[PDB]
Amino acid sequence: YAMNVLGNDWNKAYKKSARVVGDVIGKYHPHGDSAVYDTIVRMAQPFSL
DNA sequence: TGGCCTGCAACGCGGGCATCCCGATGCCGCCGGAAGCGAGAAGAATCATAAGCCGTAG
């Protein structure tokens, strides 16, 4: 939902992950930073999904 | 297509009968072995008590 509200489509340029992590911690998931980053890494691994 | 079962006819040998000689055997007495499973001991299958990682959380 945060990535959709931010407006980062597939046909756009890349963006830094720290901004997205900070936004998620600030608005919706204020439960640390390690879990969100680990979830992002897990979603980014091709051999994991 | 080749071989087998059976009817007809001819031949032979053994079933039955008795008994004399005979071989097992039931019984009796004396001696042997194995069973008797109960118990002691060893081996093995199974049960009971720690970790390692799977991913977000502190």
UniProtKB/Swiss-Prot annotation:
Superkingdom of the organism of origin: Bacteria
Outcome of mutating residue 31 to A? Reduces DNA supercoiling. Slightly reduces quinolone-induced DNA cleavage. No effect on DNA relaxation
Taking the record's annotation, the residue ranges forming a coiled coil are none
Which consequence is recorded for altering residue 34 to W? In PPA-18 and strains 233 and 227; quinolone-resistant
Q: What is the effect of changing residue 34 to L?
A: In NAL-51, NAL-112, NAL-118, NAL-119 and strains 58, 158, 218, 231 and 235; quinolone-resistant
Localization (cell):
Cytoplasm
Query: What does this protein do, in the record's words?
Result: A type II topoisomerase that negatively supercoils closed circular double-stranded (ds) DNA in an ATP-dependent manner to maintain chromosomes in an underwound state. This makes better substrates for topoisomerase IV (ParC and ParE) which is the main enzyme that unlinks newly replicated chromosomes in E.coli. Gyrase catalyzes the interconversion of other topological isomers of dsDNA rings, including catenanes. Relaxes negatively supercoiled DNA in an ATP-independent manner.
Any other noteworthy remark? When the enzyme transiently cleaves DNA a phosphotyrosine bond is formed between GyrA and DNA. In the presence of quinolones this intermediate can be trapped and is used as an indicator of drug toxicity. The enzyme-DNA intermediate is also the target of a number of topoisomerase poisons, including toxin CcdB. Few gyrases are as efficient as E.coli at forming negative supercoils. Not all organisms have 2 type II topoisomerases; in organisms with a single type II topoisomerase this enzyme also has to decatenate newly replicated chromosomes.
How is the quaternary structure described?
Heterotetramer, composed of two GyrA and two GyrB chains. In the heterotetramer, GyrA contains the active site tyrosine that forms a transient covalent intermediate with the DNA, while GyrB binds cofactors and catalyzes ATP hydrolysis. Can form a 2:2 complex with toxin CcdB in which GyrA is inactive; rejuvenation of GyrA(2)CcdB(2) is effected by CcdA.
Print the domain comment field.
An N-terminal fragment (residues 1-523) can be reconstituted with GyrB, but the complex no longer has negative supercoiling or ATP-independent DNA relaxation activities, although it is capable of DNA cleavage; ATP-dependent relaxation is inhibited by novobiocin and non-hydrolyzable ATP analogs. The fragment has ATP-dependent DNA relaxation and 30-fold improved decatenation activities, unlike holoenzyme it preferentially binds supercoiled DNA.
Q: Which family does it belong to?
A: Belongs to the type II topoisomerase GyrA/ParC subunit family.
- Record-given protein name: DNA gyrase subunit A
Naturally occurring in which organism (per UniProt): Escherichia coli (strain K12)
Q: What is the lineage of its organism?
A: Bacteria, Pseudomonadati, Pseudomonadota, Gammaproteobacteria, Enterobacterales
The gene behind this protein is gyrA
From-to range in the entire protein, with total length: 50 to 98 of 875
